[PDB]
């Protein structure tokens, strides 16, 4: 068993958008759990259902790393039982979530002088997402009776809105990279031991 590729998840140069968040499966490796929280760069470390100090003595079947970028003021919405735009239309965590949410400020990378429009979030949706559901469709949103025919007009809106990211924005409007580690332990033999 080799080392788990947590470094690729956390030190990736480019992170996904919150509506198209990346997920990486991790199994059959030795995990440096207690070594993940060694730097002071993490400005949000919140575990639900597992103690971060008990990870090194726990064997799991799978570890799923869901990575994306959101706004600072929206980092509070990455948690079970949260509501809002990110929680309802972009990324939803279940009520009985068992994992850890690690978010850090990336104003240096994900924020450009002219505005970084690569990161987008779903602004309109007819219903809230089920847990761990990803919606990437760019269909024009129909808020009225007249069909949109693929063109935005009155009562027809593009569902995805972009965070204009600039280095002058306040900390609540600066980009934050979020990685959610979900630990799955089924009856199958565990292979992601510490």
């Amino acid at each position: 068993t080799n080392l788990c590729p947590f470094g690729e998840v956390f030190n990736a140069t480019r992170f996904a958008s919150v509506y198209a968040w990346n997920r990486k499966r991790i199994s059959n490796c030795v995990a440096d759990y207690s070594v993940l929280y060694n730097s002071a760069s993490f400005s949000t470390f919140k575990c639900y259902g597992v103690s971060p100090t008990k990870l090194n003595d726990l064997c799991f079947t799978n570890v799923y790393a869901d990575s994306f970028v959101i706004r600072g003021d929206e980092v509070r919405q990455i948690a079970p039982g949260q509501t809002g735009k990110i929680a309802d239309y972009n990324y939803k965590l279940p009520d009985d979530f068992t994992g850890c949410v690690i978010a850090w400020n990336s104003n240096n990378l994900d924020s450009k002088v002219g505005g970084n429009y690569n990161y987008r979030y779903r602004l309109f949706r007819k219903s809230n997402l089920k847990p761990f559901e990803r919606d990437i469709s760019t269909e024009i949103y129909q808020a009225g009776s007249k069909p949109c025919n693929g063109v935005e007009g009155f009562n027809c809106y593009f569902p995805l809105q972009s965070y204009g990211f600039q280095p002058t924005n306040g900390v609540g409007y600066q980009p934050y990279r979020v990685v959610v580690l979900s630990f799955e332990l089924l009856h199958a033999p565990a292979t992601v031991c510490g």
Partner: antibody
Amino acid sequence: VQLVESGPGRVKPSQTLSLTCTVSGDSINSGINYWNWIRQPAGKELEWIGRIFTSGTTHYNPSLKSRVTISVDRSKNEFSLTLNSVTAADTAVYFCGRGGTDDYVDYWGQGTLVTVSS
Amino acid sequence: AIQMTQSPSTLSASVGDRVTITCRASQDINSWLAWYQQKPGKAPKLLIYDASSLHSGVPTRFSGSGSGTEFTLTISSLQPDDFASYYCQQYKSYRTFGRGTKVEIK
């Protein structure tokens, strides 16, 4: 994705250069696509003109922000570039392209030569 | 704006050699760099993005390295198809291209 450039290649100075990029094989009003215009003078390096997103939002090179307007005709599935107050320095080969991000251009057109003279 | 200085202006090499082209940014651009290849009279072809990621379909002999203010495009074994012009473009603030490096036959 196939992009074809069209337009008059003998525009006069101080007039408005208009170019049209016809996109075939992919839609211009769906998906996350950044339709870019990039120009290259003869014997010089590339210069990024600008981009338009599928929602209509445009982004421009700050040196050409005041003279460049990029629009999209969703009826004909095309996107057009208009550069006004054109001087002799705007003679170049113009390419249109598609990009999935606001960072680089991965698809390119054949490019059309536009000459500016009186 | 960010100015990209690319060196050397002209590079002479033979088929099978190891080619190194350097690009330097005026300010810190992290790893937001891309490398394009262009033939005379043809449209440019994307080779590298994010300064290290190979574009799909590009031969594996191309490598991109560096970060911050120094980046490098390296060709391990040169081939006749690789004699062209190579451009580095940063996208830390808008998009700016370098003047390019021409690889000629020695």
